[PDB]
Structures are given as structure tokens and as C-alpha cells.
Design a protein around this motif. Structure first.
Motif, PDB file in Angstrom:
ATOM      1  N   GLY A 234       0.779  -1.215   0.000  1.00  0.00           N
ATOM      2  CA  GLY A 234       0.000   0.000   0.000  1.00  0.00           C
ATOM      3  C   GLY A 234       0.815   1.271   0.000  1.00  0.00           C
ATOM      4  N   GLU A 235       0.349   2.260  -0.739  1.00  0.00           N
ATOM      5  CA  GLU A 235       0.936   3.591  -0.726  1.00  0.00           C
ATOM      6  C   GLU A 235       0.289   4.377   0.406  1.00  0.00           C
ATOM      7  OE1 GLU A 235       3.774   4.022  -2.082  1.00  0.00           O
ATOM      8  OE2 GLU A 235       3.477   5.053  -3.980  1.00  0.00           O
ATOM      9  N   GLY A 236       1.030   4.599   1.475  1.00  0.00           N
ATOM     10  CA  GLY A 236       0.441   5.164   2.663  1.00  0.00           C
ATOM     11  C   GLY A 236      -0.200   4.095   3.526  1.00  0.00           C
ATOM     12  N   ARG A 237      -1.015   4.540   4.474  1.00  0.00           N
ATOM     13  CA  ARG A 237      -1.777   3.623   5.309  1.00  0.00           C
ATOM     14  C   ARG A 237      -2.976   3.058   4.560  1.00  0.00           C
ATOM     15  NH1 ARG A 237      -1.301   7.965   9.544  1.00  0.00           N
ATOM     16  NH2 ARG A 237       0.735   7.473  10.443  1.00  0.00           N
ATOM     17  N   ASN A 238      -3.189   1.752   4.709  1.00  0.00           N
ATOM     18  CA  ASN A 238      -4.300   1.031   4.102  1.00  0.00           C
ATOM     19  C   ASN A 238      -4.342  -0.388   4.643  1.00  0.00           C
ATOM     20  OD1 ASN A 238      -5.285  -0.573   1.142  1.00  0.00           O
ATOM     21  ND2 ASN A 238      -6.569   0.885   2.256  1.00  0.00           N
TER      22      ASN A 238
END
Lengths: 272, 44, 88
Positions: A234-238
Motif C-alpha cells: 500500500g501507498e500510505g496507510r491502508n
RNA sequence: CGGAAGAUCAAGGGUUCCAGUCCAACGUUAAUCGGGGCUGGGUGAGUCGACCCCUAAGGCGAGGCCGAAAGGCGUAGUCGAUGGGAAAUUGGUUAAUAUUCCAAUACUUGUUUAUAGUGCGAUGGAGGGACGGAGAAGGUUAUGUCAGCCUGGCGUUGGUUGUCCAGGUGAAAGGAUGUAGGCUUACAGUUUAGGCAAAUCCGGACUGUAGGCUGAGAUCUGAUAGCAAGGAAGUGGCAAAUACCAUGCUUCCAGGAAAAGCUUCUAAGCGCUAUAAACGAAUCGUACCCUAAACCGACACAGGUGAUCAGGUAGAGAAUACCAAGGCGCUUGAGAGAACUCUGCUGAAGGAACUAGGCAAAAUGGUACCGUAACUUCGGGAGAAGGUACGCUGUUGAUGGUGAUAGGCUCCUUGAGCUUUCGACAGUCGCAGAUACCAGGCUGCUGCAACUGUUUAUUAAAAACACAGCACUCUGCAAACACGAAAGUGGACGUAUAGGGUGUGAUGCCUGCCCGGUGCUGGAAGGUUAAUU
């Protein structure tokens, strides 16, 4: 009881320690002690099979009498000791012949009082009796599962069991898990709940205190890469997916018990 | 800075030595292969 | 046996340390068999030099030196030498 | 240089160590020199270390379990130190070894013989060994310094026969002794649901009867040792370790190896304790480097490399500056004194106008005292900010320690000498007294993350990870879960106040609505539906 530390450091601001002035300040009984090296959570393949285990303080094993087969010989409580191997306190018993043992200490168990094992014993804390000789509604601990094997259930600090009733050769016990189950009536139990009832009221305060107890840090699956964990990526939080362990087994609600040979011992469970 | 080879005689003889080779079937195949090549050094 | 004691002493050591040890303390230096014990050196000295008594034997193993000759790298034999103290 | 760039090691190396000889190559130059070539030499142990006895992790593992084979596991065992287990110190000597040789004075442990007494014997029982973190008050020594003493000196330039100058000079282990500390009731008797059997030993229950163990250091002995110029001295004060008493004491929680040696007890079964005398204590290592040119980095490479010893004057100090002992000047030099580069020093006036950005620099910096805001979880913020004093000389008040001297391994009073800490007053010099080295810059607003920590070895240190805390969910024990083909393991010699998984991430105030989708949990009326038949 529970004693807050003064916020004289940020690592002390949330320390709430369990304090017992009444327990032995000296060393344990040397003859009931065994060496016990740490495992790191590694099995005989040298593989981590249980995560977050490692370090901590060297501790000896105290040999606990979970069986209580010195029947009809009274014992006196010499001392109540701290045990690093469990959350309950232990009591050093001194028998009439002079043999010394360790048992799990009940809450209402003090230094000096007399404990008994067998079937003709008073219903007082610390006495070990077969479940057929214990009156219904008595609060018990240290429950035997197989006859003669020793206590396995209700051993942690504060642990109690409701002895609800009987059907034939079975005693019906309500466990603190919310579970009603059968136990053979020839299995033994000890009267009273377990000492150190305020174990669960404590607050470690700082990360180093968890390290002192042999616990390594825990890294959330979402903080990994997908090659490490189903939650990684994931790009960032997810999150993206249904929650699951690193081995792909769901962790929100999915039931994991699979044991048919014992399924008949269980009356029911509680819903909340 | 610290480099890759940090010599220790006991560790050398215990991971690569003659008795360590002879303890395994695969180590004995290492030895059979070295002898077939005719190496003047069988084991460290 | 009396045939093993004839091989214990391989020959004397002639050097400045040996010479001055002989002058000051009367102690003989031998190159001895690589496998000889102090007791064997004592017995061999007392048998091959009739009329002497041995107080002390001091032994030591000296490693042989590497001497590259021609195109080859070779080494000399190790040897053992004994300092033997005799009755004055 | 000197908390090393000196000294002792471990590891690693292996002759590099010492002498002689040589200079082609090697050495970033030359070399007569060398860790280079060649030839010789050099490492001496009952006490130092290894070996050995013992075990930790972890291996291997008669039988045993498991597995197509190969193999995997595992009991008894047997290995495995980085840990436990006997014992010596001073001084001299070599070109090169020394707790090893030599001298002196010790210590440990055996064998054999003899003399007496006499129940001995374990892989088993019991004791013991035997142990954490932090902190504190002492008492000491190592050591230092001054003095004393001994030996020399009278100074190229004013003075220097003196209250002057320089150099030298302090014997250990051990044996006695039993101190400052520390711990602590002792003995006898009766018996026995215990220590797998046995036990006179431990444990237990009763009955009587009422200083010991340990221990640094000092002192005596060891002790008529050794040690210089050509045959001397060798004992008083003070200071003082991080070493020792001390594996002690006090506190805390995170609750702190094992086994043997050792002391006792008996079992099967059939030697032991004293006194000595003689004789012994094998084998291996020992040179040398080791903050390095000898190890790991291809190099005689500005890197890395565990432990130990720890002088002086200042100083809190193992910082720093300058020195001692000891060791070095780092294996190309010589000139010149352009630009430019690097590393520094000073800089008129201005003072961030520079720049993406005060980057870099500059600046601050010590101790005592005074003083210190918002806010705050009441801890803090805080060394907030900001002030003042500070050298030397003389006089003088108080004060801690140690104790000569007198008086009644000890006590009390007194206090010489030496040394500690605060002050006061008066003077005095300079631009400047925390004078050098050394040694916080500080404030206001605001985003993020509670904080200490961790991370992309080698372009990212963060707002990322972790974290104490919170919640959900699983798990009743042959637990769930994980490794494994299985046996066997971890979870855990734990047991729902526990253990796993998941998210969130101190704390404060809190955490709304949606169960259509997809999961999960429960249900089974009906529909559909496998092998099989």
C-alpha cells in the motif's frame, strides 16, 4: 494493592505496581528449585514458533505440587512467596513429617494456617478435595482434568471456578471463560480463589518493563510489505483485506477449535 | 571498519574441519570430491 | 628396557648459552628424542655417563625454521632439547 | 605521545625475536639500515596457562520412536567453556627466557615404608559450592608527596656554606596475630507418616542444660636480601584509589547458572585416621607483534580489533594542558614563497542586505549567589530569561580529619605537626583574574509524533517502526497457534487476571450513522448437490 509511581520520569508516569508487603523477602526453598534456560520461542528445529519471546530475567523454576497427594498429613503455611514463573503467589507448605512443598496460594491463605489434602478435609482455602466431596456453590481453583494428573485449570492469579452442580459422575463447572463444562467427579480441586487478585490492575508504564518480562516488540501486519504479511503493501496507510494472521488465518471472529474427542465434556458457552 | 573474515581457530575447525566433514554423508562427499581432484589441502 | 634409553639422547648442543651454562652451573644441554620424557632423559643421562647424578631436567620443544632453498619452500625438523643439571 | 604513540596479555599470526653478514629484488627516494636475503642462535615450570576433574547453551547419542531411501528426533549417557575445581613470592642473570634459570624464603598435592589407634566403602542421601540490579556509610592498602637520612655540588651572569641545589634511599609471598567491619545462640538427650532403599547424616516433633565463625589492613617475623658513585642511606607526617574488607551491608523487583571438587551419612560388599621418613608431581605452551609495518582490511593502508596496568602539576575527572618512566619524529628530500585549492588567524564601516534556507562561521560557555514568564499531567518548563562576584598580598573569624605529647591491634581528656572547608577586612597590578586548553547561545508563534528507544551496513533517522495503554477476536489444555513428512518440539513444566492473532497507540475530552456488498457467527424449513449404489 496498586501503587502509582510519581511522574518523576516520563517512563514512570504510568507505572502502577502491584505491591504485597506480606510475601517473603528472602530466597525460595533451594531444594524445590530447578534451572530453566530461556527458549527465545524457538523449538527443537531452532525455528521461531512463538513470536515476541526473548530476553528477560533469569529465573528458576519452582516445583509446584499441583497433585496434592500427601493426603491426611496436615501442612502448615511456612511462607508466601513471589514466583517469577506464574502470576499467582505460591505457598511453602511444611508437613507434619517435615516434607516441604510449594502450592498455589489462595487469596484467603495466610502464613501459619493448616492445609489438608484428601477426602475428609475441611472446606477451607488451600485444602485439596475430590470434586464429589465439595459442596455445590463452593468457589474452587486448581481443577484437575484427568484423574490423578494434577491441577490444570484455574491456576492464574485471581482464578476461581463456580461449582454449579452434578450429573452422575460429572461435576458441572462454570469457568471464568464463560464456559460450562463437565469434569469427572473423582478429579480434585482446591477451595477458594487464587491469590494476587489485583494482578490485572497493574500498568507496566514503559517499553523496557515489557522487555524485562521476556517480551520482544510486536510489528503490525499493515506496517509490512506484502511479501511478509497479507496486510503488507500500500501507498500510505491502508488495510485492504479481511484481517488475518501472517499465515492467512482470519483473526476477527473465526473459530479455531477442532477437537471431537473432548466435545462431549462441554455443556455450553456464554453469549455477550 | 570491521571486515568479513574474523579468524578463530576453534570455529574454523568446528565448521569446516576434518571431523566436521566426516560427521556428515555430504561432508564425506566433499572429501571424496577433494581427493578425486587431488587437492593437497583436504580440510582447513 | 635398556634399548630405548640409547635413543633418548640425540647429541649435545654447542652454543654460547650451552657453553656458559656448562661453565657456571655444570649443566649439559642435549638434543633429545622428540618423544622422551624427563624421567627418560634422567635415566639415559645417568646410564650413558657413569658416575653422574641428575638433579633436574628441563625440556622444551623448539619448532624448526622455514628455509626456502632453490625454488622450494621447506622447513627443518622440530627438535626437543633438555637442560640437565648434574651433581657438583 | 604520555588513560599512549608507554607496559602486560587474550585472539590472530608464526620466527617476524637475537647476533653476524649482504644490498640485486622487496622498502613508494638513497640506504652502509630493515619485519628484506643468507648463516647461526634463542622459548627451561608441581605453583603461570593448557591438558586434567565438572558441568551451561548446544551437539552426538547402545537400546527407543519416526521416516520411500538418504535420514529426522530422542532416553541413559557422552561430549562441549566463554563459567566452577590444589598450590610463590621477591631479587639477580642472557644478545635474545624467566613467578620457568639462579639465590633466599614459601606453599599445594601424591606414592611407598613404618608406628599406633581403628568399621571402611557410592555413580546414592544431606550439606556445601552457589552466584541479581542498584545504592550507601565507613575502614584500608596500592600509590603519591613532603620530610628525614646518605652521596655529591658551591655554579661561564647579580646572588648562592644555606631555611641552598641535585641525585639516591621505603623488600614480597608466607608464618604468627586476630583488629576496623560482617554474621551469629550453643551443647546434650528422646523419638520419627519425610530425604525412592539404609543412615549415627539432614528434615520434623519434644525434654533439659547456657562467646563462636569470618575478616581487609596494621604489628612482629620473614629480613644481616637486593640496590651507586668506588664501597652509603633505608624512617616519620600527610594525602589517597574505580583495588581490598565486600560472594559484605541496605534496599528494590524484573526474583537472580549448573555440576563437580569438598564435608558427612549409610547400601550392596569386605580399608581409614594421626605421626613422621624417603621419594615424586607427567605432557603441551612459553620467542616475538598484539590501538599493529607482525591480526582483519589486495599495500609497511589515516579504518577496525576484547581485557589488564594507570606516575606528576593544575583540574570534578580516565576531560584538558604541560611533563615523568618509557617510547617516538609517522621511509622522498631541497628550494621558491605566483595564480588557484585546502586548513587556519585578523579585519574599517555596515550587520543576513547572503542564501532555497543564517549553510558555514561568528557567538555562548565555569563555580557561588541573586533572580526567573506563559503553560503544566504539578513532576516539570528551568541552567528559562537575566544579573553580580571571581587574580595576587597581608591580617583575621569559624570549621572537618589525623594524631605527637602528657594525664587517667583497648577506652577517655588534652591537644604539637600536617592537612579540609567556608567567610570578613585591608591593600595591590593590569585592557582584561572562570585570563591558556577546556567549556550551554537564547527567546516568540505554529504543524507532526506523547515520551527513552528503533530503522533503509554503503545518498532517506523521519511525521516511518516500536512503545506503555486501549479494543475486538480466538483458545478449556493433547489449547488456539507455529516448526516438522512424521516422530518430536515451541506455546509452557504456562492454564482464560493465561496464551495467540488483529487493529489502534501516553494522556485529556471522546469516539455519530449504515449489516445493502464482502467476511464472520448462529440457524436449517425448503431448493440444489459428490463419491457410492
Amino acid at each position: 494493592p496498586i501503587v502509582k509511581a510519581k511522574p518523576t520520569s516520563p517512563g514512570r508516569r504510568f507505572v502502577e505496581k502491584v505491591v504485597h508487603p506480606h510475601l517473603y523477602k528472602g530466597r525460595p526453598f533451594a531444594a524445590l528449585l530447578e534451572s530453566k534456560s530461556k527458549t527465545g520461542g524457538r523449538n527443537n528445529n531452532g525455528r521461531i514458533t512463538t513470536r515476541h519471546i526473548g530476553g528477560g530475567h533469569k529465573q528458576h523454576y519452582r516445583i509446584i505440587d499441583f497433585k496434592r497427594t500427601k493426603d491426611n498429613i496436615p501442612a502448615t503455611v511456612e511462607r508466601i512467596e513471589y514466583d517469577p514463573n506464574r502470576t499467582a503467589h505460591i505457598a511453602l507448605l511444611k508437613y507434619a513429617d517435615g516434607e516441604r512443598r510449594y502450592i498455589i496460594a489462595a487469596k484467603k491463605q495466610a502464613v501459619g494456617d493448616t492445609v489438608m489434602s484428601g477426602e475428609a478435609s475441611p472446606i477451607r482455602p488451600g485444602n485439596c478435595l475430590p470434586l464429589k466431596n465439595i459442596p455445590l456453590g463452593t468457589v474452587i481453583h486448581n481443577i484437575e482434568l484427568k484423574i490423578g494428573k494434577g491441577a490444570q485449570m484455574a491456576r492464574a492469579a485471581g482464578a476461581s471456578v463456580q461449582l454449579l452442580g452434578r450429573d452422575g459422575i460429572y461435576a458441572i463447572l462454570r469457568l471464568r471463560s464463560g464456559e460450562t463444562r463437565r469434569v469427572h467427579v473423582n478429579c480434585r480441586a482446591v477451595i477458594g480463589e487464587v491469590s494476587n487478585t489485583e494482578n490485572n490492575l497493574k500498568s507496566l508504564g514503559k517499553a523496557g518493563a515489557s522487555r524485562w518480562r521476556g517480551i520482544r516488540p510486536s510489528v503490525r501486519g499493515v506496517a509490512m510489505n506484502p511479501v511478509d504479511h497479507p496486510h503488507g503493501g500500500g501507498e500510505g496507510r491502508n488495510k485492504g483485506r479481511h484481517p488475518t494472521s501472517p499465515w492467512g488465518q482470519k483473526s476477527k471472529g473465526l473459530k479455531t477449535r477442532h477437537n471431537k474427542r473432548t466435545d462431549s465434556m462441554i455443556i455450553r458457552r456464554a453469549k455477550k | 571498519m570491521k571486515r568479513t573474515f574474523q579468524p578463530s581457530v576453534i570455529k574454523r575447525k568446528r565448521t569446516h574441519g576434518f571431523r566436521a566433514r566426516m560427521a556428515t554423508k555430504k561432508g564425506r562427499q566433499v572429501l571424496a570430491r577433494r581427493r578425486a581432484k587431488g587437492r593437497h589441502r583436504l580440510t582447513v | 628396557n635398556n634399548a630405548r634409553l640409547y635413543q633418548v639422547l640425540r647429541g649435545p648442543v654447542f652454543s654460547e648459552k650451552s657453553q656458559m651454562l656448562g661453565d657456571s652451573l655444570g649443566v649439559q644441554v642435549f638434543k633429545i628424542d622428540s618423544k622422551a620424557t624427563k624421567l627418560e632423559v634422567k635415566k639415559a643421562v645417568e646410564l650413558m655417563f657413569e658416575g653422574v647424578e641428575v638433579l633436574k631436567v628441563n625440556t622444551l620443544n623448539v619448532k624448526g625454521k622455514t628455509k626456502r632453498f632453490g625454488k622450494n619452500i621447506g622447513r627443518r625438523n622440530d627438535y626437543k632439547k633438555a637442560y640437565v643439571t648434574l651433581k657438583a
